[PDB]
Amino acid sequence: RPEIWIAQELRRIGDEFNAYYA
Amino acid sequence: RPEIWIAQELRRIGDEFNAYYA
Amino acid sequence: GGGPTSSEQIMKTGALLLQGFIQDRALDPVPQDASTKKLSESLKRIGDELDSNMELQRMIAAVDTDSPREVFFRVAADMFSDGNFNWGRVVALFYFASKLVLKALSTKVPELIRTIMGWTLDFLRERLLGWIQDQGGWDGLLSYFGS
Amino acid sequence: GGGPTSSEQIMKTGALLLQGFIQDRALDPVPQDASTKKLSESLKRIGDELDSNMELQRMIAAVDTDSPREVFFRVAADMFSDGNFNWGRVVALFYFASKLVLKALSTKVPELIRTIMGWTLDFLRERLLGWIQDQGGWDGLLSYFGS
């Protein structure tokens, strides 16, 4: 399901942001 | 009322078209 | 099995012409047979002309946005109230219908933004607020970005 | 009289940030005080980055369009299902909300076209059809345009 793919991609993106901004 | 202005302008436009296309 | 004069064909071809017109004023092109495409090309020219009618554009933008349906039928009825008919009027009505689509949406984007904001802020209040408070609110994100 | 940690300010500032974000991804800019504008500028950069994420764009476009609300809450719930929170996730959720606005509308334009076509063709059938039949249908308009 694209919805789950998107949730997974946004979580990945968020956590990557956090690694760089923290 | 803009609605009436528009109806008047479209009628004018239509009848002008008809003068040129007929 | 009806020809061009049949109500069936008038409604079918009218729908194709109108849909093509509305898409012109804007995704993919309405499929049209050769004769119908030829009409559409003429309608494109009239639409192009009327789009440069700045007064008309100003007035269409000025119209009250709450009930586009009432606007449509009032304009349509008013246009033809003298009992006269000609092709110029029919095409101008189709043009107005096309502009109403763009106008109507112009109401839609604001309403969609507000609706989607409602979901997001609802989720935030009920699921994220506690954690955000732990950061000292959005001033925490200021810090996060190095500001 | 609450400060940044207050639920009042978190909801007020969150609404301003989200509305500004959604308008970025697109009319006039949401009025924001100096500190809030500074956050918005950072969010603009993250949005800019994620807009170039072609896989993500493909998937957002691929989503079933019937109930954007269900999509939003399923994504939101899924994102935070591991019980973890950070600012990166909050911002990515705001980004998704902004894209949902554009997506949702993409359903709206088709539905608006069909609705407005309904009015127009209804008027045509009941008010114009007789006259159009007198022309021999739309082939009459072909003649009219000199085709």
Numbering used by the authors:
A (entry chain C), B (entry chain C): 143 to 164
C (entry chain A), D (entry chain A): 10 to 35, 47 to 167
Question: Can you list sentences taken from the study reporting this PDB entry?
Answer:
The intrinsic pathway to apoptosis is regulated by interactions between members of three factions of the Bcl-2 protein family: the BH3-only proteins such as Bim and Bid, which initiate the process, the essential effectors Bax and Bak, and the prosurvival members, which oppose the action of both other factions. Unlike Bak, which is constitutively anchored in the mitochondrial outer membrane (MOM) via its C-terminal segment, Bax is largely cytosolic in healthy cells and accumulates at the MOM only upon a death signal. Core/latch dimers of Bax and Bak form on treatment of the monomeric proteins with certain BH3 peptides and CHAPS, and Bax and Bak core domains form symmetric homodimers, supporting that unlatching the core domain is a necessary step to Bax and Bak oligomerisation and permeabilisation of the MOM. Bim and Bid are both potent direct activators of Bax, but Bim is less dependent on interactions via its ‘h0' residues than is Bid.
Here we describe the crystal structures of BimBH3 26- and 20-mer peptides bound to BaxΔC26. We therefore made a complex instead with a BaxΔC26 construct, this crystallised in different conditions to those used for the BidBH3:BaxΔC21 complex. The C terminus of BaxΔC26 (G166) is visible together with one residue from the vector (serine), whereas the C-terminal residues 168–171 of BaxΔC21 in the BidBH3 complex are disordered. The BimBH3 peptide is helical until residue Y163, as previously observed in complexes of BimBH3 with prosurvival molecules. The Bim and Bid peptides differ in length, but the structures of the helical segments from residues ‘h0'–‘h4' are in close alignment. The C-terminal residues of the Bim peptide (–R–R– Figure 1a) are disordered. The first of the ‘h0' residues of BimBH3, P144, makes similar hydrophobic contacts with Bax as its counterpart I82 in BidBH3. The alkyl moiety of BimBH3 residue E145 occupies the same space as the BidBH3 residue I83, but its carboxylate moiety does not form a typical pair of hydrogen bonds with the guanidinium of Bax R94. In the BimBH3 complex structure, Bim R153 forms a planar stack, with the interactions network formed by Bim D157, Bax R109 and Bax D102. Bim R153 is also hydrogen bonded with Bax S101 and the backbone carbonyl groups of Bax D97 and M98. A small shift in the position of Bax helix α3 between the two structures may be because of the contacts between Bim W147 and Bax M79.
